């Protein structure tokens, strides 16, 4: 395939990172 674990790793990183950003964002947006 080529970059199986590589792409998957980046996907998880970008993902989990997005949820973390959206979490703090929504948590602050909900209050405001």
């Amino acid at each position: 395939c080529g970059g199986m674990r590589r792409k998957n790793d980046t996907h998880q990183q970008d993902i989990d990172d997005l949820k973390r950003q959206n979490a703090l964002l929504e948590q602050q947006v909900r209050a405001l």
Binding site: M4, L25, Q28, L32
Partner: protein, 32 residues
């Protein structure tokens, strides 16, 4: 590769989904 494409295809769609929310969350924060 047995289910790399399936897992990758899901990771992308799942990641893109969070990206769409990140824009909406940031939009409401930026707009207000």
């Amino acid at each position: 590769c047995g289910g790399v494409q399936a897992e990758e295809q899901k990771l992308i769609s799942e990641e893109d989904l969070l990206r769409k929310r990140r824009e909406q969350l940031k939009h409401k924060l930026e707009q207000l």
